[PDB]
Design an enzyme around this catalytic site. Structure first.
Site, PDB file in Angstrom:
ATOM      1  N   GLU A 232       0.315  83.290  19.161  1.00 20.22           N
ATOM      2  CA  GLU A 232       0.839  81.969  19.440  1.00 20.22           C
ATOM      3  C   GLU A 232       1.482  82.005  20.809  1.00 20.22           C
ATOM      4  O   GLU A 232       2.220  82.948  21.156  1.00 20.22           O
ATOM      5  CB  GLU A 232       1.963  81.593  18.481  1.00 20.22           C
ATOM      6  CG  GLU A 232       1.553  80.918  17.230  1.00 20.22           C
ATOM      7  CD  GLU A 232       2.725  80.665  16.333  1.00 20.22           C
ATOM      8  OE1 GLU A 232       3.851  80.553  16.835  1.00 20.22           O
ATOM      9  OE2 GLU A 232       2.543  80.574  15.110  1.00 20.22           O
ATOM     10  N   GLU A 280       2.122  67.818  15.478  1.00 18.84           N
ATOM     11  CA  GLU A 280       2.278  67.781  14.022  1.00 18.84           C
ATOM     12  C   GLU A 280       3.457  66.908  13.643  1.00 18.84           C
ATOM     13  O   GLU A 280       4.624  67.301  13.762  1.00 18.84           O
ATOM     14  CB  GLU A 280       2.389  69.179  13.429  1.00 18.84           C
ATOM     15  CG  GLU A 280       1.044  69.905  13.397  1.00 18.84           C
ATOM     16  CD  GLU A 280       1.185  71.387  13.191  1.00 18.84           C
ATOM     17  OE1 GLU A 280       1.442  72.101  14.176  1.00 18.84           O
ATOM     18  OE2 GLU A 280       1.006  71.856  12.062  1.00 18.84           O
ATOM     19  N   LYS A 283       6.587  67.826  11.152  1.00 17.97           N
ATOM     20  CA  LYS A 283       7.601  68.782  11.629  1.00 17.97           C
ATOM     21  C   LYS A 283       8.857  67.978  12.005  1.00 17.97           C
ATOM     22  O   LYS A 283       8.797  66.758  12.196  1.00 17.97           O
ATOM     23  CB  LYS A 283       7.101  69.549  12.865  1.00 17.97           C
ATOM     24  CG  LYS A 283       5.952  70.483  12.607  1.00 17.97           C
ATOM     25  CD  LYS A 283       5.736  71.386  13.796  1.00 17.97           C
ATOM     26  CE  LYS A 283       4.763  72.525  13.484  1.00 17.97           C
ATOM     27  NZ  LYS A 283       5.151  73.365  12.303  1.00 17.97           N
ATOM     28  N   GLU A 288       9.057  70.233  18.270  1.00 14.88           N
ATOM     29  CA  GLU A 288       8.186  70.681  17.186  1.00 14.88           C
ATOM     30  C   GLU A 288       7.019  69.759  16.898  1.00 14.88           C
ATOM     31  O   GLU A 288       5.955  70.212  16.480  1.00 14.88           O
ATOM     32  CB  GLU A 288       8.974  70.911  15.902  1.00 14.88           C
ATOM     33  CG  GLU A 288       9.967  72.072  15.956  1.00 14.88           C
ATOM     34  CD  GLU A 288       9.300  73.424  16.183  1.00 14.88           C
ATOM     35  OE1 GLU A 288       8.704  73.950  15.229  1.00 14.88           O
ATOM     36  OE2 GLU A 288       9.375  73.979  17.308  1.00 14.88           O
TER      37      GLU A 288
END
Length: 306
Positions: A232, A280, A283, A288
């Site tokens: 990541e 996303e 989140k 985030e």
């Protein structure tokens, strides 16, 4: 390069459509954080490499029984004969206590895979850069004492099975913690020259510094033969300091162009997975919900050349 297929959102495209996005953009690898059937059924036969992970809540189960490990592999790996499995990532940033089940779960998945004759698929785990007590200079790399306590047996296991270690590496996060401690360019792949001179090696970006620091820490526990995979890495396009599309594009594109070269003390392409395919929405508000290279609507948040 690889891209992390995170699914903590209620409005993403169908798995099949996502797989076409990988294909057309030239994204060679995919990271899933759990055996998603729709994604696994879709990606099969496409040549896209896949890292399939075992959620942290099933570790105790994989650790306890070999037969448990076996069933998991049968349903999640063997059930899909046309997918190109690269690694099985057992655990993602497993913290305290639960770390007791790390190696046993890893041993069991591994044995199950070797029994099936699928030993080409390496078993590993993914750790957080937060496990580094010291990361600069690279030669002074070292885990925290908490991490040091469980990282030993993990590193040795990997060495014994010829598997890499996966590290979730975010300069943005190292920098954001105290923007006054280092200059953002150092983290953004935008420094003029050497920022850190370590012995006979000079670092010009926080990504290299960290990777090399990882190698040094790994070495102190018998991991000098283990490779590091960056599972990541990314930079957010909104929600916080320095979080914009201009910065996220500058970071991600340089990452992409950079990784094939390697680091000062470790030259050679570093396998890398960019976090993440889409923003996303499930989140917590902030950065985030902004790691994505794409919007759910399928539009790029910023242009990238993979």
């Amino acid at each position: 390069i690889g891209v992390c297929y995170g699914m903590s959102a209620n409005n993403l495209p169908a798995a099949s459509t996502v797989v076409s996005m990988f294909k057309s953009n030239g994204i060679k690898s995919m990271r899933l954080y759990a055996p998603n059937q729709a994604a696994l059924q879709a990606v099969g036969g496409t040549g896209i490499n896949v890292v399939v992970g075992a959620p942290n809540d099933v570790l105790s189960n994989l650790a306890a029984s070999p037969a448990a490990a076996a069933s998991w592999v049968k349903s999640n790996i063997q059930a899909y004969p046309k997918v190109s499995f690269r690694y099985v990532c057992v655990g993602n940033e497993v913290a305290g206590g639960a770390t007791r089940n790390l190696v046993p779960a890893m041993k069991n998945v591994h044995g199950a895979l070797v029994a099936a004759g699928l030993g080409h698929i390496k078993v590993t785990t993914s750790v957080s850069q937060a496990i580094l007590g010291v990361f600069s200079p690279p030669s002074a790399g070292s885990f925290t004492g908490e991490a040091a306590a469980f990282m030993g047996p993990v590193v040795q296991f990997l060495a014994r099975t010829n598997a890499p270690l996966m590290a979730n590496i975010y300069p943005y996060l190292a920098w954001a913690y105290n923007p006054s401690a280092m200059d953002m360019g150092y983290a953004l792949f935008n420094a003029s020259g050497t920022v850190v001179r370590d012995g006979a090696y000079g670092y010009q970006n926080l990504f290299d510094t960290t990777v090399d620091a990882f190698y040094t820490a790994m070495g102190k526990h018998g991991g000098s033969s283990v490779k590091l995979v960056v599972s990541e890495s990314g930079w957010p396009s909104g929600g916080g300091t320095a979080a914009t599309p201009a910065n996220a594009r500058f970071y991600n594109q340089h990452l992409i162009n950079h990784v094939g070269r390697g680091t000062p003390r470790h030259p050679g392409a570093i396998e890398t997975y960019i976090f993440a395919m889409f923003n996303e929405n499930q989140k917590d508000s902030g950065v985030e919900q902004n790691w994505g290279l794409f919007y759910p609507n399928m539009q790029h948040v910023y242009p990238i050349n993979f």
